[PDB]
Amino acid sequence: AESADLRALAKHLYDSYIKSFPLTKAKARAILTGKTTDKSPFVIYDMNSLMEVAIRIFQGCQFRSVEAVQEITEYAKSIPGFVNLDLNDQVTLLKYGVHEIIYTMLASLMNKDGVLISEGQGFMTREFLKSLRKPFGDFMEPKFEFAVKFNALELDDSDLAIFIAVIILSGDRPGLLNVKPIEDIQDNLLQALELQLKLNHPESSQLFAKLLQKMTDLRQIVTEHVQLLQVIKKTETDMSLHPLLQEIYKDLY
Amino acid sequence: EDMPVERILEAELAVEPDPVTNICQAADKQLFTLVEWAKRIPHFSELPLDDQVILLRAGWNELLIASFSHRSIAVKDGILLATGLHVHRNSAHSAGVGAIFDRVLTELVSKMRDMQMDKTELGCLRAIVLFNPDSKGLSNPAEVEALREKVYASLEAYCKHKYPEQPGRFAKLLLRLPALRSIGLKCLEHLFFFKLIGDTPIDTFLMEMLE
Amino acid sequence: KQLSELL
Amino acid sequence: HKILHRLLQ
Ligand SMILES: Cc1oc(-c2ccccc2)nc1CCOc1ccc(C[C@H](Nc2ccccc2C(=O)c2ccccc2)C(=O)O)cc1
Ligand SMILES: CC1(C)CCC(C)(C)c2cc(C3=CC=CC4OC(/C=C/C(=O)O)CC34)ccc21
Question: Nearest-CA residue of chain B relative to A145?
Answer without folding.
Answer: B134
